[PDB]
């Protein structure tokens, strides 16, 4: 279809690539600041009623990366029939360890075509050491801290399908609030800050009965081929319970997803994002 690719040009390190549960909570806190409580309940009713956002994925200078579908591995020897077996084996193994794909190679793996993995990941996971200095005696106490450090042109982006009146009413004023506060991590050390641009992405996808999830799933029914993701965040200092999501690129069949509202002892109810972002996919026999 036609999606609105919201790009996040970084201005420092991150803490992690944002997922969809920790983008929607950040969009929730951004709307309550500039609009209030009655619009956050309207935001949640817009996602359930209409289109929903996806997880964040890297890019590197007009090479929008997307997750590798899990639809390829039970086909991954039929994908590579026309190869000689001494190089076909190590191609098949590096094809499976791969996490992301290009915007073009994603459209091949949706059709069970031969595809190639990218050569380079647009970021690194460095471990910057900090220190805690005593105020009188200047005594040091090293702890370690890890980050995500992007390259010269690289960044991160997510996708939005939905009505345009919900986008420029809610998603677009929230992403400029979040350009000056963080997306997770030590935002007081300048981590989750960025500059936002809006573009247009178009993905060619085959119409089918199945679909891949470009965000966290929290499924209703049991999916087809999946990969478990287990995380629960924090909400105003309250520790969220861990929830079995499904990682991105996993395969569902006619599943809308669904958010779980939580209590956590706060004044307001906390919604946790688990709507899926379906793109059509072709499967083998299971």
């Amino acid at each position: 279809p036609k999606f609105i690719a919201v790009k996040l040009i970084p201005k420092g390190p991150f803490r992690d690539i944002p997922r969809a549960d920790t983008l929607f909570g950040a969009i929730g806190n951004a709307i309550s600041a500039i609009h209030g409580q009655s619009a956050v309940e309207e935001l949640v009713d817009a996602f359930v009623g209409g289109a929903r956002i996806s997880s964040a994925f890297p890019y590197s200078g007009d090479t929008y990366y997307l997750p590798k579908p899990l639809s390829v591995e039970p086909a991954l020897e039929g994908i590579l029939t026309g190869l000689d077996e001494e190089e076909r084996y190590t191609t098949a193994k590096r094809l499976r360890k791969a996490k992301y794909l290009d915007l073009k190679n994603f459209e091949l793996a949706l059709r069970l075509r031969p595809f190639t993995i990218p050569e380079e990941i647009p970021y690194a996971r460095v471990d910057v050491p900090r220190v805690v200095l005593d105020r009188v005696t200047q005594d040091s106490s090293i702890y370690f801290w890890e980050e995500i450090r992007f390259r010269e042109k690289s960044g991160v982006y997510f996708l939005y399908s939905g009505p345009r009146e919900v986008f420029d009413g809610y998603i677009a004023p929230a992403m400029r609030f979040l350009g000056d506060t963080g997306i997770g991590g030590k935002s007081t050390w300048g981590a989750g800050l960025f500059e936002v641009e809006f573009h247009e992405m178009k993905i060619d996808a085959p119409g089918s009965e199945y679909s891949v999830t470009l965000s966290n799933a929290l499924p209703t029914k049991t999916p087809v081929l999946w990969r478990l993701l287990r995380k629960g965040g924090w909400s105003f200092g309250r520790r969220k319970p861990r929830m079995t999501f499904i990682a991105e690129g996993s395969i569902v069949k006619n599943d809308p997803g669904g958010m779980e509202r939580l209590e956590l002892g706060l004044s307001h109810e906390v919604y946790v994002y688990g709507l899926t972002f379906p793109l059509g996919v072709e499967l083998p026999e299971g």
Binding site: V132, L133, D134, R135, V136, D139, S140, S141, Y143
Partner: peptide, 12 residues
């Protein structure tokens, strides 16, 4: 004043 010990250092 410098009331919280982190590991070996005292911070307000």
């Amino acid at each position: 004043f410098f009331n919280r010990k982190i590991n070996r250092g005292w911070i307000h």
